[PDB]
Ligand binder design. Sequence first.
Ligand code: CLA
Ligand code: CLA
Ligand SMILES: CC1=C(/C=C/C(C)=C/C=C/C(C)=C/C=C/C=C(C)/C=C/C=C(C)/C=C/C2=C(C)CCCC2(C)C)C(C)(C)CCC1
Ligand SMILES: CC1=C(/C=C/C(C)=C/C=C/C(C)=C/C=C/C=C(C)/C=C/C=C(C)/C=C/C2=C(C)CCCC2(C)C)C(C)(C)CCC1
Ligand SMILES: CC1=C(/C=C/C(C)=C/C=C/C(C)=C/C=C/C=C(C)/C=C/C=C(C)/C=C/C2=C(C)CCCC2(C)C)C(C)(C)CCC1
Ligand SMILES: CC(C)=CCC/C(C)=C/CC/C(C)=C/CC/C(C)=C/CC1=C(C)C(=O)c2ccccc2C1=O
Ligand code: SF4
Ligand code: SF4
Lengths: 29, 725, 129, 129, 133, 31, 80
Amino acid sequence: VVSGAQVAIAFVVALIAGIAALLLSTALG
Amino acid sequence: TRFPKFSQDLAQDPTTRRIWYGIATAHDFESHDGMTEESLYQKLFATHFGHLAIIFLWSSGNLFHIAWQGNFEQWVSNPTGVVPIAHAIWDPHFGKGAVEAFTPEGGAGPVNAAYSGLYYLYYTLGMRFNSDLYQGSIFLMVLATVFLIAGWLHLQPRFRPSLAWFKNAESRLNHHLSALFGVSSLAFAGHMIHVAIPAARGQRVDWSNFLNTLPHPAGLAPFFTGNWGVYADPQAGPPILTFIGGLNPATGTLWLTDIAHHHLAIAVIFIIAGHMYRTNFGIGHSIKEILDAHKGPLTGEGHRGLYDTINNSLHFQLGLALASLGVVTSLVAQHTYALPAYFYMPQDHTTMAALYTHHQYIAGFLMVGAFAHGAIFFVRDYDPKANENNVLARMLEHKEALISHLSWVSLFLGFHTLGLYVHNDVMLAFGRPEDQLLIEPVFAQFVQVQSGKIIEGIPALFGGPGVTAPGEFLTGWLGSVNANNSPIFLPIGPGDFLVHHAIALGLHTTTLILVKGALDARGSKLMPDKKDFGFAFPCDGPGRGGTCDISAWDAFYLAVFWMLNTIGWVTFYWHWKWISIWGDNVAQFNASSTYLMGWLRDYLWANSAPLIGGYSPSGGTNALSVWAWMFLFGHLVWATGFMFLIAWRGYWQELIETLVWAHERTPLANLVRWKDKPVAMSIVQGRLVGLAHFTIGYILTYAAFLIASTAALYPNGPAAFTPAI
Amino acid sequence: LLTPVNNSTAIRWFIDNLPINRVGMDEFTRGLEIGMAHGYWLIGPFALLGPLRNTELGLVAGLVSTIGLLLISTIGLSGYASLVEDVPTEFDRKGWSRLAGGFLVGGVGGAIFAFAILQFFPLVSAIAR
Amino acid sequence: LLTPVNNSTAIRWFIDNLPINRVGMDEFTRGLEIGMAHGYWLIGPFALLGPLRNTELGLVAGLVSTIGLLLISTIGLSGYASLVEDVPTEFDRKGWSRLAGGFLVGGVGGAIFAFAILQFFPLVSAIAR
Amino acid sequence: GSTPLFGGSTGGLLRKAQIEEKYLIVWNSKEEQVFEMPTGGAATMVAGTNVLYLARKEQCHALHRQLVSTFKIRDSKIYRVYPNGEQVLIFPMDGVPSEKSNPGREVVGYVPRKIGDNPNPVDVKFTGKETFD
Amino acid sequence: SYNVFPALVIITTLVVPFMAAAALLFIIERD
Amino acid sequence: SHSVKIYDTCIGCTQCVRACPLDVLEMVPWDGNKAGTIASSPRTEDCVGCKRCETACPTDFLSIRVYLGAETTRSMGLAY
Ligand code: CLA
Ligand code: CLA
Ligand SMILES: CC1=C(/C=C/C(C)=C/C=C/C(C)=C/C=C/C=C(C)/C=C/C=C(C)/C=C/C2=C(C)CCCC2(C)C)C(C)(C)CCC1
Ligand SMILES: CC1=C(/C=C/C(C)=C/C=C/C(C)=C/C=C/C=C(C)/C=C/C=C(C)/C=C/C2=C(C)CCCC2(C)C)C(C)(C)CCC1
Ligand SMILES: CC1=C(/C=C/C(C)=C/C=C/C(C)=C/C=C/C=C(C)/C=C/C=C(C)/C=C/C2=C(C)CCCC2(C)C)C(C)(C)CCC1
Ligand SMILES: CC(C)=CCC/C(C)=C/CC/C(C)=C/CC/C(C)=C/CC1=C(C)C(=O)c2ccccc2C1=O
Ligand code: SF4
Ligand code: SF4
C-alpha cells in the first residue's frame, strides 16, 4: 500500500519539483 | 498597462483587447519586442525542458493515483473480474444516489474507472505491486526536477548554448538517432528481457535481485561468440529473443519475446543510422552536400538551398515534425487495435475504443498544425532568392495546378460517394434493398491476400507470403491472420468500401483547404501583397467584392472543421465495426452501413440509449450519469460556438456600447469603473473562440458517447483465439 | 436626457444618504454599513434554499456560505481598491481599500447577526412560556 | 551584500504583494488581511495540542485561546503604534494604529472562521447522507 | 575620487547611517593595492583618490592607522556626514597631526593640580559639580 | 481504501484558483 | 495607430481623400502623374482602419494601403 509516510515523501519530492519549476519560470520570463 | 511586456503595441491598447491578445501572442516568441535569433533558440531549449517536465509530472500523477487510490494489486490477482480504477472521487455536490452509483461493489467510496489502459501498460512491463507504481511516481517526479533544473541551468550566462550549437544539424541527428532512438530502444529491450519477460514467467525480478538473476541460463556467452540461436531455443532454457510472428493465441496480444527482439533489432538500425552525418571526426555525410547533388533535369535546381531553408526556419522544422508525428500517431492507432501489445487490453473494449479515438484525434490536430506552420513558414521565413528554382519554389510556381486538381478529386469523390449513399437510402426507403450500389472492396482484399488472408476469388499475385516473406515468423503470422477472434485484417465488404471513400474525401478536402492556405499564404489575385499582412489578420475589408477569411490563418480555421469531420467519420467507422464484432452483430453492420439511415438508427440512435438513461426521474442515477451530463455539456459548448461563428463583431460592439452607457448612468454602480475599456472580441478572436467551443463540444460529446456506449453495452470480451492451419 | 426616474427629489435624497454617498462618513464606516446590510439579507437564500435547508444545521451552513460569498466579493473589491488610482477622497486607493475592509467586517457581521436572529427568534416570545 | 535569497524576482513580487507591502491598500485593510491569515492557522496548535484537546469542547477552548493570544499581541502592536512617531504613510502613528485595529479584527475573525470550519466540516459532505 | 574595489559585506552601514550620521574617509593612493576593510574582508584601493563610507569614526581612524602603518599613506581625511548631506571635516582638525605640538591650539581639559589634590566628594555634595573641576 | 484528502481538494480547486485569479488580476492591471 | 501608405501608382484621382470619414488624407502636388498630385496621409493618428480609401482606389493593385497596427482609443472608434 501507499502508507502515510509515502504520501508525505511524495509531497516533499513534489515541493522540490515546485521550487525547480519556480526557478525555471522566472528565468524564462 | 505593462502586461504584456513582450509587446508595446499591445501594452498601450486601452481596451480589453490588450489582455486577450497578450495571452494569444505570448508563445509567438519570434514576434516579440527585442527578440534576436540567438535568444530565441536559448529560450526554446529551456521552454522545451519545462514541457518535458510537465510530461513526467503528468505520468507521475497517474502512477501515484493508481498506487494510492486504484486497485492494481486487486486487478493483478483477477484481471477479468476487476474494473481498473483511475482515481477516487470526492465531490461534495454528490447526493446519495451519485455516491453509491460510483462506489463499486463492496467498495469503500466513489471511484472513476480507468480507460487510459495504464494498468495494461504497467502490468505488461512487469509491475506487480503498488510499491512498483509508487517508486515509478517518485522517480518521474525526480526526473521532472532534473529537467526543470536543466532548463534553468541552460538559461544561465555560462551555459546558454551558441546559435551555432543549435544549428549543428549533423551532430543533433547523429545523437538523436543513435542514443535518443537507438540506445533508448536497446534499453527497453533490456527491460523486457531482464524484468518484463521473467514477470510473465512468474519470476519476480527487481532492483534487489536483478544483478544476480540471469535473464537466460547461458547468459552472455552465446552473445559474444556469435552463437545467437541459443536465445531462441526452447531446449536451452526459456527463450528471450524470438520471431514467432503473429499474436499469442492465449492472450490475443504480441509475443513478449518478439517485442524484445523487435526493439533490439531496431536499436541496431538506429545506432548504425546515427553514424551517417559528419561531426568532428572527418567521416560522415554533409547534409548540404547530399541535397545539392540531388538536382535532376525536370525539377530545376532540385534540392539546392533547402539546407539553409530548413536549418534557418523553425516553422519549417516544426511543420515537418508535426506531420511526421501525425502520421506516426495514426499508425499507433491503426496498429494498436490490429496488433495489440498489452496483456488484457483487447478484452477491455472501452479502453481499445478510447485509445483508437484519442490517437486519431491527436493525429488530426498534428496534421492540421503541420500545414499551419507550413503556411507560417511561407509568410515569415520563405526567401524566394535563396530558394530560386528549387523544388520548394517550383511548388508555388504550379500552385493553381495543385489546388485545381485537389479541388477536382474532392468533388469527384464527394459527388459519387454521397450519390451512392443517397441511392442506397432511396432504395431502402422504397423497399428495394437488392437495388443498392454495393461495391466490393476487392483492391483492399487483394492487399489482405498478399499477406496470407484466404479470400476465395482474390489471387495471391507473387505466390503468397510463403514466397514473399519466407521467414521464421511465417507460421505464427498465418495462424493469426486467418483465425477467428483475431483483429488482423478484419473482413470488409461494401459498407467498408463507401466509408473508405468518404474518408478519402475528408483527407483530400482537408488537404485542399490546408494546401491552398499554405500556397496562397503569400498572395493571391484578390490580395497580391498578403505576406505584408502576416499569417493571421481578419480581412482586407469589404472592397474588391469583399475579403472575409482571406488569411492563411482562416484556412487553418476552415480545415479544423474538415479535420473534425474526417476524424469523426474515421472514429464512427472504427467504433461501429468493432461494436458489431464485440456484440455479435456483424450482419447488422454489413446490412445497415451501406446507407445513411442505418448509420443514424443502428449506430447513433441505438447506442445512445444507455447514455441518455444515465440519469432519469424513473430510475435514479447510475455510473453513466457523468457521461450523460458530459454528453449534454458537449452539445451545449458546441452550439455556443455557433454564436461566435455566425454572429460577427459589429453586432456585439454596438451592444457593448449600450451596456457601457448603462453602467455609467446607473447609481451606486457607476462609482465602479473599468480600467480597460470593454470592447467586443476582435474578428479573428471570434473565429478562434467559436472554433474552440465547436471543437471542445465536438470532442466531449463523442467521448461521452464512445465511452458510455461501449462500457454499458459491450464492455468485455475473450480475445483468446484458436490459430489457423 | 432628463427623466422622472433621473429627477425625483425624495429619490435623490434617499440615494444621497445611502452610506456610499452620505456626507461626512469615513470609507470604513461606509463599507461597514453596506456590508451589514448585504450580509444580513444574503443569509436568507443560503439558509432557506441551500442543500442542507431541511436539516437542523441548515442555518449554520447558510451562515458559513454567506461568509464565503462575502470573502470572495471582498477579494474583488480589495483587488479593485489596490488598482484604481483615479480620484480623490472616497475613490482614493486607500479610500476604496478601507471600504473593502469595512464591507467584509460588516458583511460577515450582518450574516452572523441575521444567523442569531434566525437561530434564536423563539426567545422573543419566551417570556410568555 | 547581494545574494540569490536577497534577489529572486518572483520572490520579490510575492513579498511586495503581501498585504503589509501591497500598493494601494489602507493600513486597516493591511491589518485585516494579516490578522485573518494568522488567526486562521493559529487555532490549529491551540485546538489540537491544548489541554482540552481530547474533550468535546476542545475547539471552543482553542478558539478562546487564540483570541487571547491575538489580544495580547494587539496590545504590543497598538502600544508600538502609539509610540513610533517615525515615518510617513504606512509607518505613520495613525497608520500603525489602524493596522493594529485591523489585525485584531481580522485575527479574531480568522480564528472564528477557522473554528467554524473545524466545528462544521462534516457539513461539506452532508448532502450525500 | 571613487570607491575602493569591494564586493560588499554585511559588516557595513546600517539605518543609523541613513538617519543620524555616517563617516567619510578620503585618501590618495599612488599604487593600486589591497587593504583590509574595517567592516571585514579585503578590498583594493584605486590609483587615485579613494572615498569610503563607514559607520563609526573609530572605523575610519582604524583604517587611517592601517593606511599609515602598512602603506605609508599619510594624508587621510575624515568627514562626518549628516543625513541632510552636510560634510564636516573632523580629522585632522588644524592640518597639523595631533602628536606634534602646534602653536594655535587651546588647552582643553586642563586641571592645574596633580591628581591627588582633587577635593573630596563630600565637598561637592548636592551639586552637579564634579571633583575633576 | 477510499484515500482522499478533502481539504486538499478545497484548497487546490477553490482557494488557489481564486487567489491565482486575484494574482493574475494584479499582473494584468498594474501600471 | 494604423499605417496608411501611398505608393507611386497614384493617379491623383482624389477618390480616397473624398472617401475617408476621418480626414486622414489630403492631396499634395506631385510630378509623377498627369494630374500633378498624389494622396498623402498626414493624420493617421485619426485613422480608424475602415479601408474606405482602399475601396475607392481605382488602380490595379491599389495605390493606397492601410496596415492595421497598434490600437488606440481613436483607432478603435470608441466614444467612451
Ligand atoms: C450513373 C450515374 C452517374 C452520375 C449521375 C454521375 C455524375 C457526375 N459525374 Mg460521374 N461517373 C460515372 C457515373 C455517374 N456520374 C461513371 C460510371 C464513371 C466512370 C467513367 C464516372 C466518372 C466521372 C469522372 C472522371 C468525372 C465524373 C464527374 C461527374 C459530375 C459532373 C459530370 C458532368 O457531366 O458535367 C458536365 C461535363 C463537364 C463539366 C466537362 C466534362 C467532364 C468529363 C467527365 C471529362 C471527360 C475527359 C476524359 C475523357 C475523362 C476524364 C479523364 C480521367 C479522369 C479519366 C456529376 C456529378 C466529373 C466530376 O466528378 O467533377 C469533379 C468528373 O470529372 N464522373
Ligand atoms: C454537410 C455539410 C457540408 C457539405 C455537403 C459540404 C460540401 C462541400 N464542401 Mg463544405 N464545409 C462545411 C460543410 C459542408 N460542406 C462546413 C460546416 C465548413 C466550415 C465552414 C465547410 C468548409 C469548406 C471548405 C473550406 C471547403 C469546403 C468544400 C466542400 C465541397 C467538397 C468537395 C465535394 O465533396 O463535392 C461534392 C459536393 C457535395 C457533396 C455538395 C452537395 C451537392 C448536392 C448534394 C447536389 C445538389 C443537387 C440538387 C438536385 C440541386 C438542388 C436543387 C434544389 C434547389 C431544387 C463540397 C461542396 C471545398 C471545396 O470547395 O472543394 C472544391 C473546400 O475547399 N467546405
Ligand atoms: C505545406 C508545407 C509544409 C508541410 C507539408 C506537409 C504537412 C506534408 C505532409 C505530408 C505527408 C503526410 C506525407 C506522408 C507520406 C507518407 C508516405 C510517403 C508513406 C509511404 C509509405 C509507403 C510507400 C510504404 C510502403 C509499404 C507498404 C504500403 C506495405 C508493404 C511494405 C512497404 C513498406 C513497402 C512544410 C512544413 C514542409 C513547409 C512548406 C509548406
Ligand atoms: C420596504 C421599504 C424599504 C426597504 C427596503 C429594503 C430592501 C430594506 C432592507 C433592509 C435590510 C437589508 C436591513 C438589514 C439590516 C441589517 C442589520 C440590522 C445588521 C446588523 C449587523 C450587525 C449588528 C453586525 C454586527 C457585527 C458583528 C456581529 C461582528 C463583526 C462586527 C459587526 C459590528 C459588523 C425602503 C426603506 C427602501 C423604502 C420604504 C419601503
Ligand atoms: C503552500 C504554498 C504556499 C502557502 C503557504 C502558506 C503558509 C499558506 C497559508 C495560508 C493561510 C494561513 C490561509 C488563511 C486563510 C484565512 C482565511 C480564509 C480567513 C478568513 C477569515 C474570515 C472570513 C474572517 C471573518 C471575520 C469574522 C468572522 C468576524 C470579524 C470580521 C471578519 C471579517 C474579520 C505559498 C502560497 C506561499 C507558495 C506556494 C506553496
Ligand atoms: C480574461 C479575464 C481578465 C477575465 C476577467 C473576468 C471576466 C470579465 C470574464 C468575462 C469574459 C467574457 C464572457 C467576456 C465577454 C466576451 C464578449 C465581448 C462576447 C460578445 C461577442 C460574441 C457573443 C460573439 O459571438 C463575437 C463573434 C465575433 C467577434 C466578436 C464577438 C463578441 O464580441
Ligand atoms: S482606413 Fe478609413 S480612416 Fe483610415 S485613411 Fe482609409 S478611409 Fe480614412
Ligand atoms: S491613392 Fe488611389 S484613390 Fe487616392 S488619389 Fe491615388 S489613385 Fe486616387
